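hey team, just a heads up i'm posting the complex here instead of the shared drive bc the drive is being weird again. everything in one block, sequence lines first with there labels, then the predicted structure for the whole assembly after. its ten chains so it's a bit long, scroll down
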Amino acid sequence: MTVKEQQEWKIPP
Amino acid sequence: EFHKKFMEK
Amino acid sequence: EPLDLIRLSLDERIYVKMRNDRELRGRLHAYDQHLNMILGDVEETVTTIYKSTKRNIPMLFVRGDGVVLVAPP
Amino acid sequence: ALENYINRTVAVITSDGRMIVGTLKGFDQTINLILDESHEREQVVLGLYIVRGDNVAVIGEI
Amino acid sequence: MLFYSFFKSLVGKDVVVELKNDLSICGTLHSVDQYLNIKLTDISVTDPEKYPHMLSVKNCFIRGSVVRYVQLPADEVDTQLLQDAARKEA
Amino acid sequence: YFMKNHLGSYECKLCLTLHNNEGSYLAHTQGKKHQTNLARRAAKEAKEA
Amino acid sequence: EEAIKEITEKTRVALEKSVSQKVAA
Amino acid sequence: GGVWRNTEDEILKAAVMKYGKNQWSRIASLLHRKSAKQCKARWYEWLDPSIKKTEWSREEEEKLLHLAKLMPTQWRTIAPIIGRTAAQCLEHYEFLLDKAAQR
Amino acid sequence: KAPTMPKPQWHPPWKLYRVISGHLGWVRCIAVEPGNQWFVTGSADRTIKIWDLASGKLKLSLTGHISTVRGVIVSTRSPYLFSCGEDKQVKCWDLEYNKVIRHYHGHLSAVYGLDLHPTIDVLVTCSRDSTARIWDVRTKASVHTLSGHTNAVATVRCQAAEPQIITGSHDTTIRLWDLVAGKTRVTLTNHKKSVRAVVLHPRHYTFASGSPDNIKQWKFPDGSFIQNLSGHNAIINTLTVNSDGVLVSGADNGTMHLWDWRTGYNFQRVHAAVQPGSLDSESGIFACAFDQSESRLLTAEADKTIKVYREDDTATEETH
Amino acid sequence: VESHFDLELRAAVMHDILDMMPEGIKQNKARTILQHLSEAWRCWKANIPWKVPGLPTPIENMILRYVKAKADWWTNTAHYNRERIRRGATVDKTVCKKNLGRLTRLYLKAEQERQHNYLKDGPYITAEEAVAVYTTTVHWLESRRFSPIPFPPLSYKHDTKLLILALERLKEAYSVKSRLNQSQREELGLIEQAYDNPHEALSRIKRHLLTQRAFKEVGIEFMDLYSHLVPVYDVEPLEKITDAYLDQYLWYEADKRRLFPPWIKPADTEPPPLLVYKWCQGINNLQDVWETSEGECNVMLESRFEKMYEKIDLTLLNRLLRLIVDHNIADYMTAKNNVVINYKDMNHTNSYGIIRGLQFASFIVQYYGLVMDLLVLGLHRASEMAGPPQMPNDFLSFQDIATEAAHPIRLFCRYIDRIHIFFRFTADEARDLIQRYLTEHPDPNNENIVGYNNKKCWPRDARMRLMKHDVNLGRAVFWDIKNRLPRSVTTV
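-- predicted structure starts here --
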């Protein structure tokens, strides 16, 4: 999708 | 659901 | 501050002078710091050497770098 | 972005209204284009040349 | 930053673009960037004389710095949205 | 600086003192500033900063 | 409708042969 | 027991920060003085980072004075409602308000 | 500017008429009987409710499945129903018996959906591991099982006109082959995403299609993107069109963007409003189907409710 | 089994992570999100308002949906295990513990929800009617002349005997025969230290009861009963010793000053034989109770309030305890009644109702039922049923025949939660009462014999003869005894 959308849809701790 | 279960048991 | 005094005339008829002896008149719809503009119901007059040609347009965007003067008619 | 144009042949119109044909190889943010096998849209200017983004008015994909 | 958002709201719309060098090109706005560079699909000739030396090519990238005018119809644009957003800027 | 004794106790090497319980050696960390007294040994080992 | 009916008859014959093989197996 | 010394309190705070909150048996195996229930009670009473151990004002005093008459018993129910949530500062503030208004 | 942008079709808008909140759990499947008298609605409570199609009142219930049943169908020449789910129980719901008589078998794992043929006495089922059993009438066995999937089959359909057997899997591999041959002559190794929204058009062929990302149209002969739809990023879970050519696809993410049949862009771009018991972002359109008369569309969402939206008489629906 | 449901839920979660908005294939995440989902489900199982933060909108929505699905599956398994609880289908060995745990956590969530509704909402106890009941109890105590409790001093003679009896009871309850635990050893040690140093123990108990106005975390454990689960609550050992001490003191003071009347008194007597026998003899020794020649009638009503537990006004409890016992012990009892509730992982709330398992709780329930007895029976009726404080009557006897023949209510008995009335009435009072009943709740379609609790003791010649008269008399008496007491404190 995108480089920023990859970091946006990330599971945190 | 929970009400009847808590009443009959 | 000069850019705010232009907010002052939003939805108000404006007179604009551009490089190359062209003049537009229309209703101010938007502008930025670059003085990019969107006008509606605007007429352009080009002055070529002397005759003057006209051009009508319901809605036009204008690149700010061509802009010289922005006043009212 | 000019990304879809890489390695493909292109038509180039400079601001002064001149026209070139060539293979778009490189390009940066300032629209500096790297070109190969250029020609006056039919004289061969060069095999490789670099052009300033200032001079570019328009690029077309052919 | 404002006019970028504006042009993003104009994708897949037919527009006529006039460049400084008296070149006029109709087409479909496919892409817009920060410099207000435009990419048009389905190039066409609005005027007989001004129109440059093309034919087969259907897609162009236009340098933002070279455009004078972008022609729009009143239907393509919400005026009130524009006015309050223009007011919004600093 | 934490060192274990032979009877189930702790002993501080830098503070050179004894610790009665595990909480005693754990309270000579913020206190017993022997770490600030190591600057002379660090200057003797290396003349530059 | 004719090609669909012919394809349905061919599929019915193939399914009948497969069912006969499964019944005999 | 449960003297709650400062060197034990720092070790309990370090064990709560390192090991966790819902693991009381893991924190009681590194102190050698209290059990797991006493360590959890200390962590919920004095070693909690959200406990407001100071700044007793007149709004909280008026809130506690307008709550001890509606419910005379069950001071633990009014611990988190008043905002102290220490289960012993409320009784101490009630004793101070009863002794100061008696003279 | 856009395709079919200056040519808007003035269709009627939707207006809510009634809601039937009697199911206990997220709905699974919703279908209407042929007589416009019965309406089979599935739910995760393992109990299919046969309600009224137009009235919406609960006519009867039917159990037998141990878990949620996400597949329901009805025959044409057979006055009985057919169920399919993770319990491997097919409730042959006859109008006079109303019991379990089908006893569908052949799947080696859980079933997700099922379909029956309108002309031939063939069927299709979407098993879990790799199975796809063609339930033959009065056989309860897969004589010719069109099994071309490597995972849980999402959707499967069988007809007697165009692709007699069109199905898709979640293992990035589909079997778009002819049901007469059985072998995968044309492996549709595409649609890696969750593609589970396919409905019919209303004229002849070259109808529409669906996908979770960048949905477009389809074609009967060999398939073809005839009508390029808009950017429908909503994950479509089902598609059911009316008899007048109207097509609407239910979204699994709650945003059921209703589009027209000619343009492919969301005319309304509406979303499933949550009930007061549901959460903020918990709902998803499970099923949406127009009635036999196309008078009121029944939409069963995850709120345990069947909303009956009728048509409104409006003409100011023209977009530039 | 539920393992297949859990596997299907895990597969659905994997498919949603792969299909439900995967955000493109860019080396996406792994089962750590599944671990977060499992942790969120466990947090919901704790009845906690926590959640699974640190994720986007659609991932969180899918996680909540899968959690709700797994919860529905678990609740359905628990409902199937509870339906198979009485017979249990020849009850198994291993599934019993799992079903009992599931039901325990379900009841823990239900009690937490009830406490939250009592705390956020205002389900009061009819403050007007509550003040009225308090005034009625005040008049009753003034008529009985019962003095309040002189809170235990340290220089009392029989206090050592009471503490030794309390220690003996606590030891007989703690360890029966070769029983010990991690904390039970602490209880035995405390009992031994008390038996060694009774003066120090009495001083400590006085210090706790006079100053300690709180309590520690009390746990709960449900007894694996077939029909009705009997919960047992665990408390601190020193708190338990003080509990037994002030409990026994309250019992001794009440038996000395006759705080409890005989009708509300499952008490010093053989419970089954004495109750049933005196009951039948009073029904037989009445003023010609079996005579039905003049059209008289008799009605016997048996009930259980189902409101002698958590359904209590705690502030009303504190007020009544201060009315009958000194302020310190009453405040300590009101504090201990709502101290804490802790499950295996959860932490149930307090200030919702009385904890029946805590020691010294029997004094409260029998005194809470005493106010309800004063409300239902009345003032003059109870004053005639008991007799004067100078010369009271027996458990079912009157001072004179007029005291029984004046009012309708003749015989009255009460269990820990049960209630049994027997009243004779003439035909004129019967007609008036049926008139009032039909005016309030008529039965025009003759649907008055539909729902009637009948027995199976020879239901051909011994069951209730369902006629037009008696069936309506029963319903109307039941309604009359659903009007005396308020419907918010207790019902039948």
